[PDB]
Amino acid sequence: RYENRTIYGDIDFRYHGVKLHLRSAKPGFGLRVNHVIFEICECAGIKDLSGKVYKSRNDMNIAKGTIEAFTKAQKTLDEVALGRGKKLVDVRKVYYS
Amino acid sequence: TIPKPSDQVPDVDAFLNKIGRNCNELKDTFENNWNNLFQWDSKILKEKGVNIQQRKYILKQVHNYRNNRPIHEIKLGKKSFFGGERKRKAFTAKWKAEN
Amino acid sequence: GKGAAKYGFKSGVFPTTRSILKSPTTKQTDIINKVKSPKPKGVLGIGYAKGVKHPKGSHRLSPKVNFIDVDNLIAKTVAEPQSIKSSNGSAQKVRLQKAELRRKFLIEAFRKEEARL
């Protein structure tokens, strides 16, 4: 998770029925997601998140799908940088807000 | 500032008569005091118990007198003997029929 | 309220600001040059091609742009009085003063506009 508060990129992931869409969030903007997702984020330390569930909204499958998306759909910036052989700066951090 | 009573209208009553619009029958609400009439304002007149239109007219005529403009009974507007512009056509026809 | 964000969040409208000079002046040289330059042809052409005819009753070209000589305009709208010293009576004097003031203002306005553009 980016800055120990939100996911890295805007992820869009399908787990069985549920189609997930989870956008990253500016700091202060809270958790604005399906109640299951919110619950999972509270436990997993995600402060800021936007997103919306399409197709199935089966609670169990949401719970399973969202943790899968977190672990799998996300790429940390550092990993991406390593793969590509490039610098991958975060502009806000550099600025100092 | 008080002005002097002229030869043509030396009295309050005389002034009232001059200005008209039924300003007579108003000699009891204020007695014939020249200074009194002129110094008095709108609120005082209202308290005394004069009309709105009368009050307006008197004050205007006082002002004219102070400025030495010619005061006289400029009468209020009157509808035609036949009728108001709208009602004339019918009224006139009725009058013709009668006569 | 939604559509006010186009116009800088301005609820309500003003009437269009009315141009003091209603045609381009003679002093606006660049505009004149643009007008008088050879009009293009082909794909992005304006007029008629040299070989091609135009409808019988209709004009071939567009009408010419009447460039305002500003000094001339001033003279016409706001002529100074030829009989310079004929002035007696109070009302007449007042009228003359008013006229003078109107001359001043309209002159200034036009000249300013010319300079401003």
Partner: protein, 305 residues
């Protein structure tokens, strides 16, 4: 699953068991009584820790989690007490290690449940006076003063404002005895601002956060290519953070009308460009909506804008 939960104390207290039919007492009321301790002929709950006011520059904020709900101290000696099997009070058998070992931050924490809320320090009157002197007589800039002491520039300005008012009051002889006593009590309650202690000094590099910075951006620059704060600012299309901090730290024709002896008011004519001046036509009437605009007059009268 939510019920209506009557708010009993989390800490343990002597509940009601049985009682005389007529008294009609409640467990909450009993708990409150216990918290208070016994009340005087005067009205004072003397045995309660939190009754009297501290004269220590150490705020006596609440620690219900630490003392486990037992608030009663002996007034003269400030030594803790409990409610025994008999109605009489007495000392506790086991001593509390939680109350003995407490942190610096939690002493300046008024509410137990919110760590973030802390009390601000109070300036000593001498310090305030010195600041005032610096700004007026010595003629130093406010930024320099702020750097020296560890206050923020608006804070410094506020202090200066208050000092001049206080002086004026003293001259007029408005500062009464009762007011002075109150001021002294308040001073005693709060902790004092130390200009040397680095942890107590206010952080003077706090700029406010704009909208463009919050929305996160990322750039794939070459592995070696450097990218400083200035570059980031340029990307975001802002001025740099340092410049904004520095800024924070640091015409039109008007006519007046002629005033004749009789007339009661002037006419101030300001210039204004056409297409920008008037009250616009077909604007949104907001008077019957709940987003209606309510301003205030020069005389403090509430006026619909």
């Amino acid at each position: 699953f939510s019920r209506r939960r009557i708010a009993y104390p989390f800490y343990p207290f002597k509940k009601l068991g049985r009682q005389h039919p007529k008294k009609h007492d409640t467990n909450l009321k009993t708990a409150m009584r216990q918290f208070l301790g016994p009340k005087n002929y005067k009205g004072e709950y003397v045995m309660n820790k939190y009754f009297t006011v501290p004269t220590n520059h150490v705020p006596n904020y609440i620690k219900p989690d630490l003392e486990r709900g037992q608030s009663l101290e002996h007034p003269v000696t400030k030594k803790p007490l409990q409610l025994r099997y008999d109605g009489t009070l007495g000392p506790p058998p086991v001593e509390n290690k939680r109350l003995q070992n407490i942190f610096k931050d939690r002493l300046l924490q008024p509410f137990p449940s919110n760590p973030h809320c802390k009390t601000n320090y109070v300036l000593s009157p001498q310090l305030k006076q010195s600041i005032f002197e610096e700004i007026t007589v010595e003629g130093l800039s406010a930024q320099q003063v702020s750097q020296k002491y560890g206050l923020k520039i608006p804070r410094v300005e506020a202090i200066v404002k208050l000092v001049s008012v206080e002086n004026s009051w003293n001259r007029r002889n408005r500062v009464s005895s009762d007011l002075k006593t109150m001021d002294e009590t308040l001073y005693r309650m709060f902790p004092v601002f130390d200009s040397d202690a680095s942890f107590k000094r206010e952080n003077l590099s706090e700029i406010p956060v704009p909208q463009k910075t919050l929305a996160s951006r990322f750039l794939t620059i070459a592995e070696s290519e450097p990218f400083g704060p200035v570059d980031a600012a340029h990307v975001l299309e802002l001025e740099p953070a340092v410049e904004t901090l520095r800024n924070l730290s640091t015409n039109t024709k008007v006519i007046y009308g002629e005033l004749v002896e009789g007339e009661r008011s002037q006419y101030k004519f300001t210039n204004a460009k056409v297409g920008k001046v008037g009250y616009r036509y077909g604007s949104g009437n907001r008077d019957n909506k709940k987003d209606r605009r309510i301003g205030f007059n020069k005389l403090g009268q509430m006026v619909y804008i």
